[PDB]
Amino acid sequence: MHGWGYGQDDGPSHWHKLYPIAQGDRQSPINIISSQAVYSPSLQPLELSYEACMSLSITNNGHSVQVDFNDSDDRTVVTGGPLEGPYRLKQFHFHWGKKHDVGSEHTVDGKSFPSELHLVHWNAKKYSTFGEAASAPDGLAVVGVFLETGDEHPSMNRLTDALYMVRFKGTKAQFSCFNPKCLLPASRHYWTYPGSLTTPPLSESVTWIVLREPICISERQMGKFRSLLFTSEDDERIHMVNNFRPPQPLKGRVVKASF
Ligand SMILES: CCOc1ccc2nc(S(N)(=O)=O)sc2c1
Ligand SMILES: [Zn+2]
Q1: Considering just the CA atoms, what is the radius of gyration of the chain in Å?
Q2: Which residues make up the binding site for substrate?
Q3: How big, in percent rounded to 5, are the helix, strand and coil portions of the chain?
């Protein structure tokens, strides 16, 4: 194949042609069967410690919109949960659908949400850089958050209005002072399991922490996401929607629940 994406010919069903781990045994996302999750009271409490999160840029890369963070210090970290130590926040990005019915990567008891946020952290204690950690075992901790449609979300206009600046693939804009505290739900309950990156290279490097409680945005904010393009300034315009990987087989992994 010549590239990867979400189209008919370059989409998730074909990724295995370039990325054979696509058919491996620790692949994400999965369908979370709520009643087959194993309670785990032994888990430490999940601490998204984001007080000094210092944002740097927002970028459309042809697959998602993505915001990066400085990660020179252990300032912005996730700790506790199933994590044997702290992980430095690198970036967040979203996945979403054509319609309300689809868009999220993980499903709960067969049910999709219209979007899913992924906060990507790395193990800077063990590994020297993020690209290294990104393909190593226990290199990453990804926290996912579903999004339903409902009433408005104020903190999430600063993000959503910036989407106009970065609408073509390849465009990057300064994005200072966005703290992602404002994208987290009240509850810190979660499911966790070992899995992979959901886009190439699909490395089996991820401890997934999926939050139980979603955040709400308005159909209106949701629509601004759909006004992004997969494609660059000098090509035919194809809007970014259905940029998600379906659930993958569990092949015997344990999904722990913290509640
Ligand atoms: C250095 C390679 O960086 C990568 C590549 C793919 C990738 N996919 C995810 S996701 N959708 O959070 O599971 S984070 C990530 C980081
Ligand atoms: Zn993702």
Answers
A1: 17
A2: 198-199
A3: 15, 30, 60
Q: How far, in Å, CA of 41 to CA of 44, rounded?
A: 8
- Nearest CA residue ID for atom 9, ligand 1: 197
Burial class for 135, CB neighbours closer than 10 Å (0-12, 13-18, 19+): middle
Cβ neighbours of residue 61 closer than 8 Å, sequence gap 6 or more: 169, 170
CA distance 194 to 122: 14
Among 21, 95, 197, 248, residue to substitute to test ligand 1 (most atoms within 8 Å of Cβ): 197
Among 16, 63, 100, 153, which one carries the catalytic annotation? 63
Between CA 215 and CA 187 the distance in angstroms is 10
Instruction: Tell me the residue type at 77.
Output: V
Please, which experimental method was used?
A: X-ray
CB 123 within 8 A of CB 138: yes
Question: What burial letters (b/e) apply to 15-49, b meaning 16+ CB within 10 Å?
Answer: beeebebbebebbbbbbbeeeebeebeebeebebb
> CA 51 to CA 217: how far, in whole Å?
23
Q: Which of 212, 143, 218, 151 is nearest to 181 (CA)?
A: 143
Q: Which domains does the chain have, with CATH numbers?
A: 1-259 (3.10.200.10)
Which residues on neighbouring strands pair with residue 216, listed in sequence order? 148
Q: What's this structure's resolution in Å?
A: 2.3
Give the distance, in angstroms, between the CA of residue 62 and the centroid of all CA atoms in the same chain: 15
Q: Which pair of structure tokens corresponds to residue 228? A: 């992004």
The closest of 125, 96, 95, 87 to 207, measured between CA atoms, is: 87
